[PDB]
Amino acid sequence: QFNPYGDNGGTILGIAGEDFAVLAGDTRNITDYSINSRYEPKVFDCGDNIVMSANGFAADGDALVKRFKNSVKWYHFDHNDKKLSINSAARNIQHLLYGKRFFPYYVHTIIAGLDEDGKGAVYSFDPVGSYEREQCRAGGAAASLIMPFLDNQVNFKNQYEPGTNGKVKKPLKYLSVEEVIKLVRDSFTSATERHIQVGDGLEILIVTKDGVRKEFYELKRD
């Protein structure tokens, strides 16, 4: 019997700073035990300082990104070139995903950018459109490896102030763009080591008020 779904592997990672937000994703595309491409980008600039990635089944992922990019275009036409806010984009994507509640998009969606106060924002979606704003989210094949590391290093979970008898927690603070990219690079090198579907290359998209910058780093190709 024809199975309309497939697993294209890979993993994605979104971290939000004070005045910036990064959306990272490995460039490896796979089916079963074969590599399709060592460089197939799945993190996209969608305009209005919104970066988006729909990891999982690449066909459904591409279809969704394509439809959202088109949603941004028609938002400009219908509302006098008004800038689509990250919170408005998030709600719009929920309706795109839930629109196919009974034939779902088999993807974990993450968008990143700046909120209307100019502060870093990351939104994460399940396949059927349940969304939530977070400081931190890993999605895809190696999400289970990366996410608990992010809890520890970004949100300082299970970390207490030395000598305070585990009474005072390590205080929350925003990370610099330099410190965040270090965590992203260490997260993906760790994920590459222990997950077979992750490797080849790492592509990070950084979003500030100035615009969308890109950075690329080599990963292990085994």
CB of 129 to other proteins, least distance (A): 5
Q: Given the complex with other proteins, which of 1 and 80 has the nearer CB atom?
A: 1
Which residue spans within 19-159 are E strands per DSSP?
Answer: 21-26, 29-31, 34-37, 44-45, 50-56, 107-114, 120-125, 131-134, 136-140
- Fill in the amino acid letter for 47: G
Q: Given the complex with Mg ion, which of 105 and 188 has the nearer CB atom?
A: 188
Q: Given the complex with other proteins, which of 49 and 123 has the nearer CB atom?
A: 123
Q: Distance (Å, rounded) from C-alpha 74 to C-alpha 81?
A: 9
Q: Among candidates 6, 60, 17, which has minimal Cα distance to 179? A: 17
Q: Given the complex with other proteins, which of 10 and 49 has the nearer CB atom?
A: 10
CB of 79 to Mg ion, least distance (A): 45
CB of 195 to other proteins, least distance (A): 6
Q: Given the complex with Mg ion, which of 30 and 150 has the nearer CB atom?
A: 30
Max CA pair span of the chain: 62
DSSP letter for 117, please.
T
Site for Mg ion in 193-212 (CB under 5 A): 199
CA angle 188, 8, 46 (to 5 degrees): 75
CB of 209 to other proteins, least distance (A): 26
Stretch that binds Mg ion, among 80-88, 176-184, 192-200, 204-212 (CB under 5 A): 192-200
17: contact with Mg ion by CB under 5 A: no
Report what 189 binds from other proteins, Mg ion, none; CB cut-off 5-8 Å by kind.
Answer: other proteins
Q: Given the complex with Mg ion, which of 34 and 80 has the nearer CB atom?
A: 34
* Contacts for 194 with CB less than 8 Å, ≥ 6 apart: 142, 145
CB of 175 to other proteins, least distance (A): 11
Report what 213 binds from Mg ion, other proteins, none; CB cut-off 5-8 Å by kind.
Answer: none
Q: What is the Cα gyration radius of the chain?
A: 18
Report what 214 binds from Mg ion, other proteins, none; CB cut-off 5-8 Å by kind.
Answer: none
CB of 203 to other proteins, least distance (A): 14
Q: Distance (Å, rounded) from C-alpha 201 to C-alpha 199?
A: 6
**Strand 21-26 relative to strand 136-140, pairing:** unpaired
**Interaction site with Mg ion (CB under 5 A):** 192, 199
